[PDB]
Amino acid sequence: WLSAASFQETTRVLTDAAINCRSDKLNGLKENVIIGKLIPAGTGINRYR
């Protein structure tokens, strides 16, 4: 939900992420940029890190 709300239609995405009580496992490349940790690509993966 956190990378779909920042794409577009923020109000519509947030108003049924709340109704469905959605949870965000922060797996993506954009959710790690927003919350401020290492993206899961490049040198930020556990093989290299």
Partner: protein, 293 residues
Amino acid sequence: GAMLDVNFFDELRIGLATAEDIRQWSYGEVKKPETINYRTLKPEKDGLFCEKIFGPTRDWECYCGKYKRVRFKGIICERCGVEVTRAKVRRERMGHIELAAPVTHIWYFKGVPSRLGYLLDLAPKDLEKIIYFAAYVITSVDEEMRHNELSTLEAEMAVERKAVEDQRDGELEARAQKLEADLAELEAEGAKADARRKVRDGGEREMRQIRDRAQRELDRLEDIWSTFTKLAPKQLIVDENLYRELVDRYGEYFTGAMGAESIQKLIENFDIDAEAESLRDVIRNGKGQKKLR
């Protein structure tokens, strides 16, 4: 889970905050529309910038200056109530406003598709009229009392309509007496043969309009009776006068309200499992606009 946010997050979960969540996040109720003093430029108590609610403006001081170091850290001044701590807690502490009447959230009422309308099965036009105080809605009805007093109330309505028609019969007799007086005072005196019929035509117009008044009043009584016999919850009553006649005659057997307090009573009397089961039966069996809806 975490609230200080030291960076071991596993998940971020979103949901729908209830009133207990809101008044559990809050550090105090704001109850004045004041911001700062116009002379001393310092925050006002209970206002929108209050230090007793949101924390102090200066690092490790209270509001009255009684406690002013890190030696007094974490205590609350017994005079002004300001907890002496950092001033950056005024970016972290929330407060709340306790409403005197319930209010709907605009996100769940307005934006297409209306989620409140889908849950309660009300059209958005019929939902706007309720929550913006333009129509009534039947929150509850009583079926046992209605089914056991329907005959007696039918007898009462028939008695009252009989009285109305007897009143029209008395008017029929009185205007017939005036009409026969007009006959005796027009046919036995010399005038125009058409002008003796103009007064009786006005009398017949008076009879037509008076029986039209009686017919419209009888139609209004039939409308009240049919509206009470077809009463169910989630049913809009525009015509404030029709609603007032209903609460006058049959003030038991049902309840009604306007606004978000009626919307929240409809949500209280809502059976999510039964509604989901009936919707799944429709999508298994039926077809068309019913199945798509």
